[PDB]
Symmetry: D2
Subunit: 467 residues, 4 copies
């Protein structure tokens, strides 16, 4: 009926210098790589790009950095993109951060005819207050700072006003597509490709398989054809796998993972951070079913897959190749972060560089030293879900991690419920710390020295660990 097929070169030739783009992809999962190369071939300059990340060294959007085609990047996470981080530090790229769920919802809103919407994410963080270093000069100093966000009260609580994002073009990748533009994605490579296809004026879409109209069930289309302007069928290539993890000294981490595992309960939908939170899922009791949720868009997330099941389309938040359990369900990034922001998870476990007696949490940033970005961290804590920090008690140089107020910039305000460590377990109660447990026959006087705040120690049982 309706045909939108083009060659790779012709579809890309409209993109003028100064063009704003929206690109799907979580790491390399769902990255339109074949189109990013053709953009590089044509030599467009001063590009402004809204994308979850910036691909990686020599892949997807990452490849556009090579001949300095990027003016600005609006992202949530840098990742292992050395060119990007270097060009930002050396004053070649302007880097503006924005939390992952907001970024997805701003794209959706800009496609939905919704100019602005409220969210509790990044409230009280440096992102709302502004001042994060968006651009450097060539020699060392700060050239530009991010502008602040508007705040407003609904109920008792404070929310940020996020503006809609509308781009000149949109680049998406899909597993399948028909001639009239109906895209069908696969695994967690869906992510931003759905809201990315909505926010763009001219959306172009590469497909790993082309099919005729009729060959796709109308009941299975994730991105309907009205959205797509141009479909492209590049030569088939293997998607880059960052961390090819498979199923086949310093383990105070194991002790935290065993206490952390007693936070789980039958019927919980949980999100686990990288490191110790993920470890705690290994120590779950016998018939206690819990569903792990990966923010790139899945529930029913399993351990590393057997060799025979490794797929670039099925990875976790840390870009590690993952499997999935029976009763699984895939969803886009706007839905994924609606699910999170909506408080639909029961337990969110997370590492931390610094955790305050407030309930505050620090990891996101260290100004001009660590510049990874917020990722999905600010969305995971600012929602109403129960948040449990799992971290060591002190830094390796003896300083407390658990403090009164955060010296470091904040991931979220008044969010943390429990703080599990190798020595102790506190609960936050009324913006003030309560010592609930301590480790095997170790003392209350010890932990008191190792943390940088006073706490309630009026009912201290001994810490239990799962087998």
């Amino acid at each position: 009926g309706l045909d939108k097929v083009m060659s790779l070169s012709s579809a890309v030739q409209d993109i003028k210098n100064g063009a704003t783009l929206a690109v799907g992809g979580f790491g390399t999962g769902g990255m339109p790589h074949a189109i990013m190369q053709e953009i590089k071939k044509m030599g467009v300059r001063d590009l402004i790009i809204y994308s979850d990340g910036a691909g990686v060294d020599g892949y997807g959007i990452g490849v556009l950095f090579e001949n300095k085609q990027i003016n600005k990047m609006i992202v949530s996470y840098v990742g292992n993109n050395k060119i990007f981080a270097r060009q930002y530090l050396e004053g070649d790229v302007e880097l503006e951060f924005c939390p992952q769920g907001s970024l997805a919802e701003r794209m959706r809103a800009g496609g939905a005819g919704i100019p602005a919407f409220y969210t509790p994410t990044a409230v009280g963080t440096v992102l709302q207050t502004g001042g994060q270093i968006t651009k450097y000069d060539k020699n060392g100093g700060v050239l530009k700072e991010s502008t602040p966000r508007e705040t407003r009260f609904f109920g008792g609580r404070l929310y940020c006003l996020e503006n809609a994002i509308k781009t000149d073009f949109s680049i998406v990748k899909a597993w399948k597509g028909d001639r009239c533009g109906n895209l069908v994605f696969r695994g967690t490579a869906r992510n931003f490709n759905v809201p990315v296809g909505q926010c763009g004026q001219t959306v172009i879409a590469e497909v790993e398989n082309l099919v005729e109209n009729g060959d796709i069930d109308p009941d299975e289309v994730h991105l309907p054809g009205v959205y797509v302007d141009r479909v492209v069928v590049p030569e088939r290539y293997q998607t880059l796998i960052e961390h090819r993890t498979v199923t086949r000294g310093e383990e105070v981490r194991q002790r935290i993972a065993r206490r952390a595992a007693l936070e789980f309960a039958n019927g919980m939908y949980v999100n686990l951070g990288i490191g110790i939170p993920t470890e705690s899922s290994n120590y779950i009791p016998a018939g206690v079913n819990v569903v792990l949720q990966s923010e790139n868009g899945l529930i029913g997330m399993g351990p590393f897959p057997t060799e025979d099941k490794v797929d670039a389309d099925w990875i976790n938040a840390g870009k590690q190749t993952i499997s999935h359990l029976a009763g699984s369900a895939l969803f886009d990034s706007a839905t994924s972060f609606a699910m999170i922001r909506g408080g639909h998870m029961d337990l969110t476990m997370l590492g931390a560089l610094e955790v305050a007696a407030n309930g505050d949490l620090a990891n996101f940033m260290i100004p001009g030293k660590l510049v990874k970005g917020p990722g999905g961290a600010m969305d995971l804590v600012s929602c109403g879900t129960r948040v449990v920090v799992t971290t060591t008690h002190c830094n390796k140089n003896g300083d407390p991690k658990i403090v009164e107020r955060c010296r470091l910039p904040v991931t979220g305000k008044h969010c943390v419920c429990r703080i599990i460590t190798e020595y102790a377990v506190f609960d936050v109660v009324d913006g003030r710390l309560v010592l609930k447990e301590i480790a095997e026959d170790t003392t209350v006087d010890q932990v008191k020295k190792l943390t940088g705040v006073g706490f309630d120690a009026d009912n201290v049982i001994t810490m239990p660990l799962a087998p």
Copy 2:
């Protein structure tokens, strides 16, 4: 995995008096009838319900009107429900109107943890200014009124602020579901069941088929299981078809429909309002192939099916059984109105009760006389899309439906680009009418006494008609 399956009675038993429900379904399509029947049996009352429509006489929400179990209703369209329309008019039930796209997004936001957002829909209409009668006394007069909505400028355009809808419960109906909650819908019976399922505190799902965890493909799940708390498998029953339409005197309607069908250009994505705009679908030139969009969750809407193809899950905005073309796509009601509100439709044609030189349209009500509701009309007119109204020139009394200013409540101000009558074609330019085409072949002589206003007229031509 998890097993959330229960009896019909035990899943409904926690619903107390005064409860708030979100209810899935469009007309009878996706109406959880089996659960509304059970809600009738245990006789709960003072019920506030959020749903697109109120079902039908003796089917769905409809059955809860029989014992006066409903206090308030929040709907977009009354539809064909005499019990409900009567109960509103004689003071028994309360009835607040909500634009359909606002209603789906308000539920989504409530699920998403977004407290508020902006939409241009319903700005300037009584629903922003407040003052639609929401309840009557028993004898005749007014009792309550709609509280106004807040407004706010982005660019130089004014937007309504819509608050999130979080309900005590959520009742949905899906075609297939597994035991850990994941739902898969069929046809245009999806609609509100997605956003409804995200917004309830305790959501409950009737399913036409139960499967084991593993039988649903992760990449076909329309509602992830995390959102679902209870799943019931009622005794199999037929979905009620309102109008069983199939492909197998004095109607001026054709004359206007044949002129309107010349607005259908090639490659256009169009939306057609119920009644007169839908009957220009016959006269699309043989070469031209448009894509019809139905607001209940379909692009690529076909003609009426043959007797063998008739499916209750495939219906239009008018609740008539419908076929689908190759390369068609289904979607939920939140997405459908993100598509419309975002200006992704090329053409939008609607009926009128009154139309004006100001660009206005009044097509949703006449007080205490005919109260159907806005439905999707307030979204379809407020977006960017070119609005073409198709109405007979004068009314059933003889008065002119074209006027200087609208007597009836406004569906949207400044929205109408062209008005197409059997006598003439008008075009609005700078808030003023301009006659472009005239018919077979009553000179301006006749047309000027049939319009309720004076208009510019220089470049006059004849009115052509399609085959």
Copy 3:
């Protein structure tokens, strides 16, 4: 500091397209000498914010003759035919603003407040938009007013009003020094305080110039820092519009005598022109109530004796007036802060139309009566109890008491009590409840003289003051 200048020298900087703010209520406080100078050097396409547009051959009104005005932003036209004529003919653009909003927005422009919230004008055409701000040259609509934003604070809805900062500000005062301190007399203060704060270059005509040191620091009303240029025009008499002095078929009197029974001891009240003002007279018992005037006075007395008349002491209806002992003056921002803040105990108005809803229409008839909101919108949108004194029916038999307002509304759900010659209704829960009937006139005739149903279950007879 010394900012004294010639009349011409101060005005000469005003280019075409300049935005002005101009003080004055009616003619009192209206800088006629400076406006006349703007006429002589003939600036084109001006935008002017002011309480009104002066009068035919006085104040801002003198600038309509050569069509030097593009856009007026006022609360009240008054007795200005040129302005009313030119608006309708399509020469002048006219955006209405409630008087209390216009002053506080000038105050806000001066005070560095970008916007503020106000219950005034909520639900009216001035919030929603749609008022004809400009006609074309044939009586067709050219421009509608842009809407105001809204927002809930607590339970109720408020309009967001934007600051107004102008290129120029023209003020008039009775006294001033060379460094720019100003002192006004009587109700001729009004908008001169807030107008003086919102201009970038603010020029002041003074009736008397004095040295620095001669004005008491404690009796300055507009501080000198707000003043850039001071001018001393040749002495001239302020135009008195209605030179009022104290030297049968009257339904109007009967309404006033019933209305006078609404007054209690210790009440501060605002009464509109006409019948509300005529009730003051029949106040029973030896003195007890304070009359407020929106142009900047509490303790408004009756008309003065023939030799104690004063141009600077005039009321909202432009009439000359006396003041009682313990009376106090204030500017137009303070005046409507006082009103908007519920500090009045009673507000009595007239009406063109009143509804069972609680609605009031008394300000505008589209393309027919070009009068404007004035204070009326601010008075009906605050907490204060709002009584309507009006004729029951129109001359010609149509009911003024109706179910819903056909005409444009001054306030939504604002009226508490309606008083007519036939009847007295109270508005309870958004509907009409009949409480009194005059004479020995039956409930049957009123039922057919008013155009809505109502409760008639505890109807006394209407009392009246002597």
Copy 4:
């Protein structure tokens, strides 16, 4: 003679039940209703909440309510020289919630004017917007309660703070004169918050220093119309308490900073001088340069200290020092004063500093734990358009750098400073970093670099001139 609202001191106070929110007039002790606060101490209300600029001073005004622990919470801009007030905060008896002085004034006007909320650029990007200034302690020194955040919103290019209107159960004011139907007149800088305080109260009570008949006050000279006043009190004549009776009868780096800053003045400037080093630069103005000094407590045309006979408690500056006034000076209330400041009508603001940054940030109201006094008028004075010129010593006690990369102390304002003036050097803030302009004596350039705190531009550098 219409209304009579006169009432005895004892009979006016009795209505104030436990838990009552009061709004009290006065700046420091100027315009403090003392005689009323004593009668409140007598009858003895507990758990009061009080809105005022200050909290008086020890044993004077709101100060006298701290003795019997009668205050639950204070909403103030300045702690002032009030020790009992201060300790109770740190020991954790009273709740202390700061509010910028111009916002507090305008919030009380807003309440009385029926304006539910208004926007203002003051305190945006300060700890007062973001939340987390310590509002109450426990008995040991840990935080119990923190200040909740303010909302923000963009008008034009820049961000503004939403400020909610203040309405109190009672309002307490002090006036030089009042008639029987409530019209008040004020004297000197003792007007200040009394005007906006008298408008925001449900029941407002007003101590006159002189009662007069209706007619006696000129209607044109009324500062607070009688409609606002519900009761009036005529206590025994008492002395308004002068904190610093100032009159005109180390190495001194302070004078070198002042003499440089006086060269920033210019004919026709209206200028505000902050407490400390900025005020002392008025001494060293060149004879031809005519300036008008503005005191934030309600005055333009502030003079030097008066001669011994001319001193009066009602004429005081921001530092509570007794002060004279020149020809063409004009008094005004505090809502008007901060309307004047916030409106950018000042041509030069000068301020002291605890810490100033290369960014353009200033921190001059708080160091958590030790010096907790509140913004005063500072946050308003840096958030207007007006040119900020900071005057400070180059280091502090214990030799640390007062010019820094970024402020570790809680900031008064963001990107506000245009010029820093010190005894060693004068800097400029350009685009977001520092520019060395002048250096005193012929002092070494590579001495000041690591004595300063950060790197800077140093291309076009002359020697620093001082005033005669």
